[PDB]
Design an enzyme around this catalytic site. Structure first.
Site, PDB file in Angstrom:
ATOM      1  N   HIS A  41     -55.629  54.235 -11.003  1.00  0.00           N
ATOM      2  CA  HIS A  41     -56.562  54.892 -10.063  1.00  0.00           C
ATOM      3  C   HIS A  41     -57.979  54.311 -10.170  1.00  0.00           C
ATOM      4  CE1 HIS A  41     -58.791  57.172 -13.043  1.00  0.00           C
ATOM      5  NE2 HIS A  41     -57.671  57.668 -13.539  1.00  0.00           N
ATOM      6  N   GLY A 143     -65.282  59.029 -16.768  1.00  0.00           N
ATOM      7  CA  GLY A 143     -65.296  57.758 -17.454  1.00  0.00           C
ATOM      8  C   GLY A 143     -64.368  57.675 -18.639  1.00  0.00           C
ATOM      9  N   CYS A 145     -61.281  57.973 -18.632  1.00  0.00           N
ATOM     10  CA  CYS A 145     -59.949  57.650 -18.168  1.00  0.00           C
ATOM     11  C   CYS A 145     -59.713  56.235 -18.768  1.00  0.00           C
ATOM     12  CB  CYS A 145     -59.844  57.587 -16.670  1.00  0.00           C
ATOM     13  SG  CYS A 145     -60.413  59.072 -15.886  1.00  0.00           S
TER      14      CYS A 145
END
Ligand SMILES: *S[C@@H]1O[C@@H](CO)[C@H](O)[C@@H](O)[C@@H]1O
Ligand SMILES: *S[C@@H]1O[C@@H](CO)[C@H](O)[C@@H](O)[C@@H]1O
Ligand SMILES: [Cl-]
Lengths: 302, 302
Positions: A41, A143, A145
């Site tokens: 993503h 952030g 992720c």
């Protein structure tokens, strides 16, 4: 003596964390050999996360659109692919700090350490457990992720988790390093809910064994019970059903303490039916389920 | 979202851990520049720990009696000295992995991370706090001695703790990196006892602020209180007295939440007088005091 929720040393993983930027989104990636792994993503805007067609969105992207930065050096993307929900960016340089590693898909109830990162920079490490409903209760902000969960046996790092989403309830969902989500979750900003979160019974029992080893014995009763009888109490209190495999895994702890497993099960039964009456076990007023039997042995021996 | 007891990434410290062996005793040391730091009781047998004269026992030792091993390489001791309760072994090689570092003496109530080691090998990392009675509640087994506690601000590692002893009660006592013990403790196997362990009030309040930030608000009452009035309740429950400095430090959290500090103090007062009534705050049934105000801000921002 003493018992703490210990995480594995994070050094071997710190050296693998990079920053991936695609468009305006920057998240963390994992640089191993000549491949960088990150959540797919990263290629999504804000409108996209509603209902993203990740295949179409990747067609609009080329190697030079993926900016991979390790520390203050830039990496040359010579290839890019999508494996399930993870993006594999092939770079021209092998990470000189790659440890011995493998990709593992852990089972609900297993524990692992998390190195939480932001823009490819480590911020902290903690120990968590894969919940039975395939969620994790961690600390992740925007952030985060691409933050990874791992175990270490000797010199071998077993990566098992990559953070992807924060569900509306505040828990977290992610994938193995092959891009397959733990649980039914999808990398979309849709209505997703976790099931009933049950307590990992075998882990509680391991923790009670650790308590005995460390002096806390008040919970030890004068009773015993059977596996079927105990499982009846477990269901009423949303505890994982205890199998003979679970009993077999606690053998080493039962041997060290001289406390039969079914004897410990009867002490736990009392704790679920009567509570702690304000007392504490190992400095906690709740029954802790994020220590595996292997964790207790490893901590008490190290 | 989510709140975990996070430790600093331990990589920079992993690269500094060595194994020191003097006679039959092997404990961990800290290799920084061309000096290895370790507990001085490495030079003691079993009879010695009763009442050791460390000066006399060091006279019987020469440079070549101290065996310092980093990984699988051996280090050449070209000098040795005693600073308070720490031994400083000068080696011929500067540690190529020395980070930017300083030696700091922390105050009771401050937090720090611990890399627990055995024979110069990391085993795990956890976050702890210097108790008000200058003890630490950790996880240390034989060979752990020389394990270090540290903080990291940017690229600077502030070493603040070296483990030395486990008291008969099961808590732990150690020194700063200059060899001065935290508290009244001495590196002898004698009858030593910690004082009353009070709860770090300012840390509990920071943790309650974190709870609000993360959604847990049930404890928030409709009342307020005064600093003198609250401190009256604190004494009855063995809580640290709250100063205006403490109130000033929580300013940033009070600003973010819109909850006055004295308003939060009144919610804590109720929690001490009535308890949790079986409820939980941030997944804990006790009031947690090992998160500093700086820790909450750093975790919520990172
Ligand atoms: S990490 C895993 O095991 C190690 C040995 O412990 C091997 O060297 C690796 O090749 C393997 O992936
Ligand atoms: S670790 C401490 O601060 C750093 C900068 O953050 C300096 O470089 C060091 O010399 C100092 O000891
Ligand atoms: Cl608790």
């Amino acid at each position: 003596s003493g018992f703490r929720k210990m995480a594995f040393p994070s050094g071997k993983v710190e050296g693998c964390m990079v920053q991936v930027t695609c468009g305006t989104t920057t998240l963390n990636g994992l640089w191993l050999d000549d491949v960088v792994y990150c959540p797919r993503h990263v290629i999504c805007t804000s409108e996209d996360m509603l209902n993203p067609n990740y295949e179409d969105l990747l067609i609009r992207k080329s190697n030079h659109n993926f900016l991979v930065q390790a520390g203050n050096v830039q990496l040359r993307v010579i290839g890019h692919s999508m494996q399930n929900c993870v993006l594999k960016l092939k770079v021209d340089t092998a990470n000189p700090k790659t440890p011995k590693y493998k990709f593992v898909r852990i089972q609900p109830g297993q524990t692992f350490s998390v190195l939480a990162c932001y823009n490819g920079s480590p911020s902290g490490v903690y120990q968590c457990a894969m919940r039975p409903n395939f969620t994790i209760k961690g600390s992740f902000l925007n952030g985060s992720c691409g933050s990874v969960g791992f175990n270490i046996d000797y010199d071998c790092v077993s990566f098992c988790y990559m953070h992807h989403m924060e569900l509306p309830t505040g828990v977290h969902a992610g994938t193995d390093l092959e891009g397959n989500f733990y649980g039914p979750f999808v990398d979309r900003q849709t209505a997703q809910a976790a099931g009933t979160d049950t307590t990992i019974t075998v882990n509680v029992l391991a923790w009670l064994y650790a308590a005995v080893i460390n002096g806390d014995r008040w919970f030890l009763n004068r009773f015993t019970t059977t596996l079927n009888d105990f499982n009846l109490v477990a269901m009423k209190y949303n505890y994982e059903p205890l199998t003979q495999d679970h009993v077999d895994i606690l053998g080493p702890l039962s041997a060290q303490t001289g406390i039969a497993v079914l004897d410990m099960c009867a002490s736990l039964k009392e704790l679920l039916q009567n509570g702690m009456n304000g007392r504490t076990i190992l400095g906690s007023a709740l029954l802790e389920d994020e220590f595996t039997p292997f964790d207790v042995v490893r901590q008490c021996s190290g």
